[PDB]
Amino acid sequence: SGFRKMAFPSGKVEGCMVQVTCGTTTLNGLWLDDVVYCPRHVICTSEDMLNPNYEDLLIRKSNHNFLVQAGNVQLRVIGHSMQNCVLKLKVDTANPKTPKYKFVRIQPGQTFSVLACYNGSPSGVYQCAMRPNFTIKGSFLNGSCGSVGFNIDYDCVSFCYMHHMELPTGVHAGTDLEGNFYGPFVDRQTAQAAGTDTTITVNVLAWLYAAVINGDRWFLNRFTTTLNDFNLVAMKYNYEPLTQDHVDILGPLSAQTGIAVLDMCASLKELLQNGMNGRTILGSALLEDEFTPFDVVRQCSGVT
Amino acid sequence: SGFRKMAFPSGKVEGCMVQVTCGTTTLNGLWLDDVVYCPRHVICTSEDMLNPNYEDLLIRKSNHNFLVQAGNVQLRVIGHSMQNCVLKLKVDTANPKTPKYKFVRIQPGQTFSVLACYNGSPSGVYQCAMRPNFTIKGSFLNGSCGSVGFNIDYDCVSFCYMHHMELPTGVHAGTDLEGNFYGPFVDRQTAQAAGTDTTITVNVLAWLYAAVINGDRWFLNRFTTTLNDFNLVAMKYNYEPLTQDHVDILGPLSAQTGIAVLDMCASLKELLQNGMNGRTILGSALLEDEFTPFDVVRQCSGVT
Ligand SMILES: O=C(Cc1cccc(Cl)c1)Nc1cncc2nc[nH]c12
């Protein structure tokens, strides 16, 4: 029992972290096989960041200008290329600690672990969700760029995020491992709208099921609702509309607890309309949306 | 910017996890040098757990009865001894992945990361605090026993906790790495009082400073208080009395923000007496006490 915001064990990812320096800028890189991936803004100075012409800036750089250090050892760079907002630095040595891996583009509302790094060295690990507006509410300081987000399935690491930027609002933006930003963001020092965010309804319902499994049941009521009725409430409270696809993904939790998804929707409707009344659910005084139905089953079943 | 419940990177600890089986019981062990440490209740059957005579139960076991597997390879057990509530199994091979380490007994109110494991395999990592009543509110299932808590300082892992038991209340109890339980607990299947818990005041104040550093400032007021006045409020709200030692440890955060510790105490006093009024601080609708002043400085400075 107990329910925590659990991250994946970070060991497989720690073994891939390197420091990349270009000119006066240092950030993190990810070394997989004989390629090091890092944000392309490693080639910029502070003056360049207002409106960088990355193509022109990269033309002034040669392989020897990219200093890549894996712990205390230097990697020899034999090639460089820009793919969208990432640089791929070909090195002459395959990372001996390369785990089985994939590059995936996650959907908004999905979760992943972040290994925050500085100077190629891991500082900490935390779990978070990709917001419906494609930002992440992480914990990142100057130098964290190049830190990655990932999920693990047995021995395979699926990398889904590389950190690039902090918006003036203090939220975070980054790319998939092919360098494509999640959301409308561009890698420039300009104010950029993130746009309206919403609460991840299917994740809140999953967390309510986790609460019932772990004994927090005070919010269960004698009511039920329909998808249409519930979605009128979700609209008022800035929650994502619940679809049958979301109801289907909640099937395993509904079967385990014996609580029909629409009955749990009625509990959620009552919590939205009345608040918590000073009570808590799984140590939280707000409705949590950073656990997917898969995360709940994984944590409640002890998947390694 | 941003503030997360960040755990230490778990890689150094993942390299020490092994599966220990004795008879029909399987749990986790920690392999450091040529010793494997695990909860002594690995020698019990379910019938034994009501009131185990560990000395007698261990006498019926020989080195060959302890099956220790590091991933897929078997370790040869050449000695066994019980130290308080842990078993130390001497093996013929030093763990090649043994990091620099220490065994420490942490104080209540301090924090640490847990690497939850099942069958010797890591499932997840999370940060938590040792409650003032010596329990931890973890996320652990049957088979998680032997999972450890730890802190990292540069390249040295200080192990402070080994998981042993879940109380009937759903909270967790365990030992230091010398097998001494934190708190009054015994390794038996009996209902056991945890006793009154309190909120870790110095940690709440540290988190309020983290909130100010990250821009959440709505709770700052025009008031101040004294240690005596604040402690009358702490008493009413089941908070630990604040001492000058706690004020001293908050010095760096008070210097960084320019907010005197007693002025932050007045903000905390007002939040305790009036609640959050439906507002949040660092994404929380309650006063968080699982970040120490050291954790706040570490996260806000990017220590690796
Ligand atoms: O935002 C940047 C640098 C940057 C500026 C403009 C565009 C780009 Cl792509 C990158 N670094 C950063 C990241 N995360 C957190 C931080 N806190 C301070 N700086 C942080």
Ligand SMILES: O=C(Cc1cccc(Cl)c1)Nc1cncc2nc[nH]c12
């Ligand atoms: O509590 C036990 C077994 C046990 C019983 C009596 C005394 C001792 Cl020392 C150990 N295992 C366990 C731990 N954490 C979480 C769990 N959820 C289910 N079982 C869990």
